[PDB]
């Protein structure tokens, strides 16, 4: 998850 | 449900002056603690007069609404 | 501590939708006085009713943002 | 007096095109004269004598109209122009007057002396109006007339569906209050000009 | 405008035509102010019994009443 | 007759045109100016001030100016046959422009502002403002 | 499951389209009242009808939020 | 399945347009009634007909949400 | 993992614009009605024409949304 | 799936502005008719030209959606 | 420098609506002034009332923004 | 082609706006023709120029999408 | 990398509303000038007031962007 | 270059506001010409002047897109 | 690092609103001329003023985009 701040939340 | 709507309205119109009296004051306190000049403090005194007019206006608005209750 | 903030900041866009609508209301009041000053009142009351309803909407959005921030 | 007559014919032909259009516009709304309400006559007349019997015919028509509108139960009010009408009705119908004007034609006819009378009527807003005068057909013959007129109270009772063909630059409700006043002024203008010309043509008898 | 000030349109029209004529040239201004003179003698009644008789030589004093 | 604009420009005291054929007219409506030709829609409008401008079929480019204080305009469509569209321009006081001045305008302006210094009544103030407008219009429209 | 607290705000973002509606509505009410005062009693009546639906829509935008926040 | 909540919210983030449309409708109704009261009995009918579409749209904008929330 | 529903929703967001368009239509209709009832029906006719396009567009959206929720 | 269907729906989000345009257009049609019906049919034509552009855009958008869903 | 910054920036998407509302207000004021100067200082008064809400609303956003940046 | 698809789908949200623009144009034209029919042609000419520029924009966005679909 | 950059840009997308408000405001001024070309200092004054408020909000947005950048 | 392509596509969404501007502009031209044809030519130049500014926005967006596409 | 391009492209979404404002403004000018072509200049003056402010906004937005890009 390079966009850890945002990606982690949904669709990980 | 109605009762919730009306108590929410009542509480908002009761705090509308409390905000402009407390939180805006805290903001201005932050500006004063951060800045030290006078010219910027001159515009600041102007803006403080403006915030005074603002508090009186909010008081008028809350009074109007409460009078409508 | 990382999602709630987004939820709150997203619920605080209804406010820009509201300020629009209040502006139109009071603009119409102003022009109405400009057309018939004999009645400033009998407008201010209807204006105030509309603005009460809109202020209620604003309270909803702010309140629910605060909720989702602490929940 | 022939000279005065030439001048008055000139004023007519140079003051009728002004009035005609707005009147022929607003008369598109039918006026029911048998309608009920506080009548208000504007019986025009002269200020001198030597005019034949034109004022006699005017006063005759007015007497008839009032004896009619009173048997029907409608209150009445009499406006006038000239002291001749006064002398001709001050005794028979002197309890019904409401306003009267004199010394009018001392100076030439103008738009101000008509706007004033129109304002006096508007301020004294009656439910229904009427005007009487002597149309100037030819230099040797005239024709008395009675123009019914559209008052604000007869207008508010009509959605004005006859004028919807027209596009009022300001909206109807923003231009009607000024158009009705222009209508009154133009009405009085035309009526008095015709009355003057008829008077003068009689004097040259 | 005038409507809100308790006023008619004809009053406005005349009281502005006055200024316009005052903004003219003489060989035509004198003619105008000649052809646009005013002399009325308003009389009021109430069941007879006159309440007033007032002369009017100018427009403003005429409309004001 | 023909398919021209039958203008009639009328003041209470002197009708300058009655059924004169023209190509284009300009008239200062209340909202703003408006230009009238054939085909234009049946309309009515209140005027406020300004310099009517007339352009004839034989002129095309030669014009005629006419100042106007207040009044109305009534544009009526042709009869079923005449093919000629009529326009009435009813001006309480229509003035040509050669007969205007700028000195007397400024003088009357000062007189009006003086009379208006004693601003106590509504009509007085409204009169002051409307006179300001009219006199500015005259000054800009004057030679 | 923070996505729930996101769906809630994404639903409350709608209220900005309701407030503008109400504002334009009451603007027209006022302006119309500045032309024909003698019929306010009807205008308001008709106006209410409009609100009688708008608020309902608004309620949904709120109600469903709660749903999307728990269920 | 937390995404279904997001989708149901999104599908419900379009009643704002419905509300603005209803506002336009009833504003024009009120206005057109100010300029001509004698014809209200028609200005209403057509208004209703308009809603007979918006409402439908609205229902969809609601209905599908539930679908997108379960399925 | 349920991206089909997301795409269905993102499709059903456009309905707002359609509703706004329909509202402007019927607003102008009642307006033109208040201004000239003698032609009323003609207006109705022309109005419907516009609807025949908007709804069409609208239909597509919903239709296409379904195509996505089932693929 | 997810990405392509997402792109399809996204591209299909530009169907609203088209409807708003058509609404404004037919509204002006109706108004200009009410003000001057004697040239009614000489106005319809122009609105059609409008479609000749607007509709295309709409069509194009729709088209691309399918392309994005089948590529 | 995480998500709280994103939230405090999203919370400044409402200022657009506030500014548009203020623009509408002062535009209507300027218009109703050009249309009736005699009552400038009346219009202005009512104008200010509107600000008492809009300015307020706007400020809230800003404040709440910081509330999220320094949660 | 996973992300190029999204890039294209995003490139076509301008089209909506464009549409709106065009709409407004023709609306104006139509009205300015219901007022003075004898001045159709002139208007038409000017109108085209508008469309001209707009179409360029339109064209551009569409083309970019195709580019962003391959490159 | 620089999520602070995204936060800055996001917070800097609100100038659209500010710019639109400013444009509408100056448009009303120019209109109000064309209608009453002698009353300009008053209109200019009220315009400058509203522009002060708008520029204040815009400066807030810009400064908050910078802050969130040099966080 | 996925993200470069997304940046391009996101940049082009400036367009869609430019088009609305040009539309309102040429629409006011069309109208103001239907009113006062005697001045047609003059109006044209003014539009061009305005167009200038707007043009020196459009290309920039586009250009930046290309910049952001080729890194 | 491709995010800087994302942030830049995002920062440029304001140019849309900027152009929209400029368009409304020049429309007001193009109208005011027709309505009152005696002046043609004082309106041009106030126009250049408003465009001064709007150009400042557009310029800081562009420069901030280039900043967030290079960084």
Residue numbers in the entry:
A (entry chain Q): 7 to 18
B (entry chain K): 151 to 219
C (entry chain P2), G (entry chain Q2), H (entry chain H2), I (entry chain I2), J (entry chain J2), K (entry chain O2), ...: 96 to 166
D (entry chain g2): 67 to 271
E (entry chain e2): 1 to 65
F (entry chain d2): 41 to 183
Publication text:
F-type ATP synthases are energy-converting membrane protein complexes that synthesize adenosine triphosphate (ATP) from ADP and inorganic phosphate. These universal enzymes function by using the energy stored in an electrochemical potential across the bioenergetic membrane by rotary catalysis. In mitochondria, F1Fo ATP synthase resides in the crista membrane where it is known to form dimers, which can further assemble into rows critical for inducing the membrane curvature and maintaining membrane potential and morphology. Here, we investigate the mechanism for the generation of the unique cristae in the Apicomplexa, using a combination of single-particle cryo-EM, cryo-ET and subtomogram averaging.
The IF1-arrested structure, in which ATP synthases are locked in a single rotational state, allowed us to obtain a map of the rotor-stator interface at 3.5 Å, resolving both the c-ring and H5-6 of subunit-a, where proton transfer occurs. In addition, unlike in the canonical six-helix (H1-6a) fold, which is conserved in bacteria, chloroplasts and other mitochondria, the subunit-a in T. gondii lacks H1-4a, and only the horizontal H5a and H6a are found. They interact with the c-ring at the rotor-stator interface. Mechanistically, the essential arginine on H5a (Arg166 in T. gondii) is thought to be responsible for deprotonation of the conserved glutamate on the c-ring (Glu150 in T. gondii). Our structure indicates that in the open conformation Glu150 is within 2.3 Å distance from the juxtaposed Arg166, allowing the formation of a salt bridge. The rotor-stator interface surrounding the Arg166/Glu150 pair is more hydrophobic compared to other structures, with subunits a and c contributing a total of eight aromatic residue side chains. Thus, the tight hydrophobic interface between the decameric c-ring and subunit-a in T. gondii is consistent with a direct, rather than water-mediated Arg/Glu interaction. The apicomplexan-conserved Fo-subunit ATPTG11 extends from the lumenal region and plugs the central cavity of the c-ring. This is mediated by the short N-terminal amphipathic helix of ATPTG11 (Ala9-Leu17), which is sequence-conserved in Apicomplexa. The interface is located on the border of the detergent belt and dominated by hydrophobic residues of ATPTG11 pointing towards the inside of the c-ring, which is unlikely to inhibit the rotation of the rotor.
